[PDB]
From Swiss-Prot, chain A:
Post-translational modification: Phosphorylated at Ser-55 by DAPK1 in response to oxidative stress and this phosphorylation enhances stress fiber formation in endothelial cells.
Compartments where found: Cytoplasm, Cytoskeleton
The protein's name in its UniProt record: Tropomyosin alpha-1 chain
UniProt induction comment: Induced in stimulated quiescent cells.
Positions where Phosphotyrosine occurs in the chain: Y33
Full protein stretch here: 229 to 284 of 284
Domain of life: Eukaryota
From Swiss-Prot, chain B:
Gene that this sequence comes from: Tnnt2
Role according to the record: Troponin T is the tropomyosin-binding subunit of troponin, the thin filament regulatory complex which confers calcium-sensitivity to striated muscle actomyosin ATPase activity.
Family named by the database record: Belongs to the troponin T family.
Species of the source: Mus musculus
Name of the protein described by the UniProt record: Troponin T, cardiac muscle
């Protein structure tokens, strides 16, 4: 009985940890996507600048 | 200085194109990433159900 209780508690702890880790990794992926979006926006602005500089 | 400007703008457009391909690859990476998020979400939800 003692061993079973220990195992059950370990399982609950690990499950909660996996839930937290999944949420955190999803949030960090969202943040990386946002920063990539900003980089792409300024890169397209610079590409337009280069297109005009082709006439420069 | 003219041919310098020419080669420099050439390499400028070149790395433009290169980093652009890299950004396309990274966008496709983000897309398959969101596919992975959705598939993990649905399979996790099935498991939880």
């Amino acid at each position: 009985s003692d061993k079973l209780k220990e195992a059950e508690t370990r399982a609950e702890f690990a499950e909660r940890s996996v839930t937290k880790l999944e949420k955190s990794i999803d949030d960090l992926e969202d943040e990386l996507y946002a920063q990539k979006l900003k980089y792409k926006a300024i890169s397209e602005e610079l590409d337009h600048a280069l297109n005009d500089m082709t006439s420069i | 200085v003219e041919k310098d400007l020419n080669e420099l703008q050439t390499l400028i457009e070149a790395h433009f194109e290169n980093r652009k391909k890299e950004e396309e690859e990274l966008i496709s990476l983000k897309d398959r990433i969101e596919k992975r998020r959705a598939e993990r979400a649905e399979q996790q939800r099935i498991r939880n159900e």
